[PDB]
Symmetry: D2
Subunit: 386 residues, 4 copies
């Protein structure tokens, strides 16, 4: 079978299984979930750990005594269960004060507050043992063209991130940052809308080695992009610091379906890529059990994220191990794609008549790529029909 | 709103030259002689033209036919005073490129692709072009095992680093611009957006040589905000060239004349390029619809330049209006340009006004005054002020 | 471009009353008293307002509280002269409707939904409304086995036929308008477009009683052309009401003020409604962004009406221009209005000029002159003629 | 196994496996395919029949002798192989004469020609035994707002369709029409963009009983719509006269991937719906083997369409037959959805206090729908992991 165990490193955001089902047209359909109950039940399902926004753990506005009491109760639940906390983030989107952004709010007083709120939670993240601190700039953006000077907003975003890197560096903390792109919602357009924009922005920070990306399946798909391809570019760059796994059925609002729902073939190729690459990060789910579900449907959904990952892993492993698939991969020249084009160097290339005057373009054009048969073997393996 | 060569408007030879053949339909216009394209665009007030190698010289031409074609194009440039600011290679039409060019799985094809590009770089330099564009239209895949994207990025980096070595070794003053596109003609294309292309550049051996050539319609095919993407390329110092056109939504690549499609995005784009003082060519990569005859082709081209000029006038008026400046201050755009924490990290951590004494409810009650600002922008665009 | 009640502009109470709560963020404005909405909209030059049952009367109110709330709203209508042309039921906010209302899998919920609607129809009639809108926001599914769509269509038909029996039996002069939406808040909503709603109507017991209430943003969330969809509803005689707003692309339902989003589609929409002489209310269903304070809410509402009026002026000028009329004839728009074969089937089959002697190459060479026509439309929209 | 046989009623357009791979940026990558070779090889793969546009069978401009010679050679191949021709259509989009439309071209002379071309092919369709005649108005539309008066274009479209219905009726032919919606491409916006618009338009024809729809998987998905839901509405209306099966990976150009590629979960629910409904039409593939493939990759692709249909049919059948799934369906109240809301009638409903004053909304709101567990059983069956 497909039973998850903590060795699989599956993690969940507290706000996932804790989502009360309030949407923009509907009230809450489930009662608030105690974080301690979340830790306990996810451990029972075979999870490895949980993640949190500051405000999922400590009530906004808590005195120091309440903050300590909440953190202490949470840590007792982690310690009883053996659950970890690999990742933390700040809620810089719920409160009305962030309605124009946090790090890129036009009001400087809000930007300063946003940094202080984040810094206090970095300290908490280190205390809990989190190794990655995620930033999701969901209010960073605009609905109209004059409301945000995007060059100046990138200056402010770079300034915020540099100050956070200086903080971590001055404290000696072992924590790294992961930026989560999203193209829109809740703003009309969000800054750093894709894996690409976020990776490019990182290269202009003071201490770029401290920053990577936290890509979410559904966010890339909201722009109609190929999520496995984006993940491959993050991997190629050495910047895949964390991931959010879920599902999305098209270009529309952010659905956060359980992983495996949505674009099932994309989920298979994503699992094939993470496993083939030997990526060792947490398999973290950022999903919302639909508001139609009661608390039992919540745990079914959570269990289903893990189950789908493990089925897909089994199928992708069987695909790569199949000598008929490996022969189809060679027939499609995947092996040549991994060979240098010109290890002989530019001068040898420029001298080589087989690369130009003697290159038979018509014979080369006649060769089929044999991609359809290869894709059908992949479909057979995914469906268990080999 | 009459264009003149001072506006630096340019067109690809393949834009006005498009014969109207689409995936469902045959050509509706005959082939256009590149010399006639140059004279007609000059009459329209254009500044220059751009070309793929195969637009100028028939694929497969002997060295003699190649020289004769080149010389003949050059005489038309010299006669009219038109320039050639940018060149590119056709690495997509011939069936040999069906699985890609710099990222073809077949190594022989990748080597041939590089040889074909280098030949054309030499011509681009001869003709005066300062930007060499790469549009990887066939780099990509329709299925998940067909292309190992990590290996493809290694081949793409290798090809671009070889091109950079080439230009440096020859002492050419030419820079590369990568044109992103999310899909079409491949199911997914590599470097699908401005951001992915910017990120990829940062890992080349000589990153200073490479920028982006973003196309309005391409970003909009992924539902992205083109002026925001251009703002990130300008902030990065990487906007080496631009393709102007229109697109109406997430669907096939329409290449409508500039101004059509998303008209408010075109207004903001013009405001941004003008406000930033970007000095590159205003290049159109558009296709006159196949419904049009040759006179409609020139109407469409004139319309590109006319729309740009009207939008330019409306954006300048927006910025020059004292009421708009007041509305910008009301919306705190001036504060967005001020450092968050010039006082530094230690002073910010010590500042009670940024945390314990920050009155969050008072701050939350402040309106942004964005709707009034945007309606002023709308009034200016529509000439209703 | 000052609105007056002669323009018949109307607003939902829930538009200017939106508190700014979104799926990621709490309310940014306090609740708006419906009486204050009526007075402020009247000051702005509006003609009327519309309401869900729950916008006027708190869900769960006793018969006494209900009468007191209703009477108080009516006095504000009578004082200002504002009208109520349309009413609708809230069948989406309360958790009991999480799986739908007329198509909930649970039969008790479907019966309760119908009872709740019928109560509100009675109020709609009392208040003078002539259109009753149904927006099935929760009719739909996130997963394939959750909803048998054939059975759901049977329940939807049953609910609408029961409503029709009700209105007929009471002798009410009121018509129903179904509002399509492709998705949000459900993964897919039933009757996702204008066409699906039009087709569904044709199978009701009393189809004459039912029309559509299409919303600009809803059609555009499926990447569809809103003026084309409205043209089909007008051709069908089914455009009973309209929701005006803006949307920028395929993404979540933005409900921007009208004019924002797709500005050229807004121009064509206004041209169509004006040209057709459609006489329904110009109703806005938009949300002032949560960035705005209460003054920004009224700026946004004024902007809806202002944009409509500027677009109206530009469309009328386009149509009145003798150069545009000439360009329309050049493009053969007059021929599109002429019967293809008034001579009938037998005469068409006997006509050699329609087949053996039809000179297809000569016909194919004719340009459509669409780009020049469209650039005249652009010049008119931008006031650049 | 999953071996197709003619009893499965799988059909292919000649232009599918015959697609030469010419796209808007690329030349043809395969040589022209002889229709006789198409019939022979599809029969070898287990197909039941083929479909055609007039111009796939007879060269445009053929003399009567050439037209008869082409038709006779084609019929000899059908007769040798036992292949059928269930459906025919007209090519009213390739030639430059149709660049502004056919039935809705602004030029009346083109509209008249378009009708004559179509009528001549209806006669041919009856001769070959086709029972459905498809209309795909792919050039009917516009790129700009003033170029097409959509009300007048619907008048012309209704006029064209009425004249075709009068033709069929006057000839006594047993053929019915199926309109194929598409939202855009190659025009900026196409008239009758979806199943809904096409079904609505039909209700205004003179003889609506003669017309239904031919929906294509990828076309509905190009508008981000749910194809199984659209098909359910066509079925509910009694208007599903034919179908085009293929795949599409998102909102983008029309990809015509082999069936099962693209949105795999949508393909499963489509198969579940066609089979559960007992729909008896041809399972017709309108796909394009990618231009990367040689002729062997073409036949692999075609074989893969049929294979995927049969795997999905097996899995959907196993899903519906599973008593654990049927119990999950009842737990989600799917049985109640099929019960009349108010068979007691309006008066009894209006008298029934349990439907209003005594309806306990809070108790009803508390019930979960149990949709996630039900969807996870569906995922397990699709993946062969029960
Ligand atoms: Co999300
Ligand atoms: Co383009
Ligand atoms: Co809306
Ligand atoms: Co298609
Ligand atoms: Mg996330
Ligand atoms: Mg371009
Ligand atoms: Mg509405
Ligand atoms: Mg088709």
């Amino acid at each position: 079978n497909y039973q998850p165990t903590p060795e699989d490193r599956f993690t969940f955001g507290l706000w996932t299984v804790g989502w009360q089902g309030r949407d923009p047209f509907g009230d809450a359909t489930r009662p608030a979930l105690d974080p301690v109950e979340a830790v306990q039940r996810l451990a029972e399902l075979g999870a490895y750990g949980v993640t949190f926004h500051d405000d999922d753990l400590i009530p906004f506005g808590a005195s120091d005594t309440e903050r300590e009491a909440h953190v202490k109760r949470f840590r007792q639940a982690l310690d009883a269960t053996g659950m970890t906390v690999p990742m933390a983030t700040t809620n810089l989107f719920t409160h009305p004060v962030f309605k124009d952004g946090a790090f890129t709010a036009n009001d400087r007083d809000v930007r300063r507050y946003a940094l202080r709120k984040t810094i206090r939670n970095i300290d908490l993240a280190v205390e809990l043992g989190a190794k990655v601190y995620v930033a999701w700039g969901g209010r960073e953006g605009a609905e109209s063209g004059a409301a945000k000077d995007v060059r100046a907003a990138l200056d402010r975003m770079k300034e915020a991130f540099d100050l956070l890197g200086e903080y971590v560096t001055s404290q000696g903390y072992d924590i790294r940052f992961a930026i989560e792109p999203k193209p829109n919602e809740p703003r009309g357009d969000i800054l750093l809308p894709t894996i690409g924009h976020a990776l490019a922005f990182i290269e202009r920070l003071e201490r770029p080695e401290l920053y990577g990306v936290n890509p979410e399946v559904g966010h890339e798909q909201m722009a109609g992009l190929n999520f496995p391809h984006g993940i491959a570019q993050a991997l190629w760059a050495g910047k895949l610091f964390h991931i959010d796994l879920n599902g999305q059925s098209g270009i529309k609002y952010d659905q956060d379906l359980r992983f495996g729902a949505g674009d099932l073939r994309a989920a298979f190729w994503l699992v094939d890529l993470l496993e083939s690459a030997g990526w060792e990060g947490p398999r973290h789910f950022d999903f919302k059990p639909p508001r139609t579900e009661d608390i039992d449907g919540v745990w079914a959904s959570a269990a289903g994220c893990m189950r789908n990952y493990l089925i897909l892993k089994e199928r992708a492993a069987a695909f790569r191990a199949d000598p008929e698939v490996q022969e189809a991969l060679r027939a499609a020249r995947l092996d040549q794609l991994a060979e240098p084009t010109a290890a002989d160097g530019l001068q040898a290339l420029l001298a080589d008549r087989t690369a130009y005057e003697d290159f038979d373009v018509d014979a080369a054009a006649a060769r089929g790529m044999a991609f359809e048969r290869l894709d059908q073997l992949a479909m057979d393996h995914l469906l268990g029909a080999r």
